[PDB]
Design a protein around this ligand. Structure first.
Ligand SMILES: Oc1ccc(-n2ccnc2)cc1
Ligand SMILES: Oc1ccc(-n2ccnc2)cc1
Length: 126
């Protein structure tokens, strides 16, 4: 069901939260080798999450579930804000700009926390 597909997508999102927090600890500790691996792992999770979200939005559209489509359009837009911040974070790591890395890291945490009420609202709407 589209609802069970959203729960699967929500779990992938929570996997990225977990890996992101370990990555933040590694960054603070200066373990740049770990950071690089976590960033690769996070890119794969976000690419997977985005694909599950697009499939869910398209299905809600085919089902005519107007409220769920509205919420998912808003939620996908916020996801892309997070993705842009992430990709900038990755560039700051490549460049050795720890000041920018810290900045982008905090921004991504705030974008994500803000988007969580909507994330829950979608589960209920599908
Ligand atoms: O697919 C995702 C979802 C949330 C993510 N995140 C939570 C906190 N900072 C990033 C990252 C990737
Ligand atoms: O709340 C978030 C967190 C991370 C996100 N992301 C990282 C890479 N692509 C999406 C998107 C939305």
């Amino acid at each position: 069901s589209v609802k069970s597909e959203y729960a699967e997508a929500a779990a992938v999102g929570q996997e990225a939260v977990a890996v992101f927090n370990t990555m933040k600890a590694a960054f603070q500790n200066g373990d740049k080798e770990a950071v690089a691996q976590y960033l690769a792992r996070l890119a794969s999770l976000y690419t997977r999450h985005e694909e599950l979200l697009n499939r869910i939005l398209e299905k809600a559209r085919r089902e005519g579930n107007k409220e769920a489509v509205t919420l998912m359009n808003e939620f996908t837009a916020t996801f892309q804000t997070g993705k842009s911040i992430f990709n900038a974070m990755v560039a700051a790591f490549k460049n050795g700009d720890d000041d920018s890395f810290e900045s982008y890291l905090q921004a991504l945490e705030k974008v994500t926390a803000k988007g969580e009420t909507l994330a829950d609202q979608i589960a209920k709407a599908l």
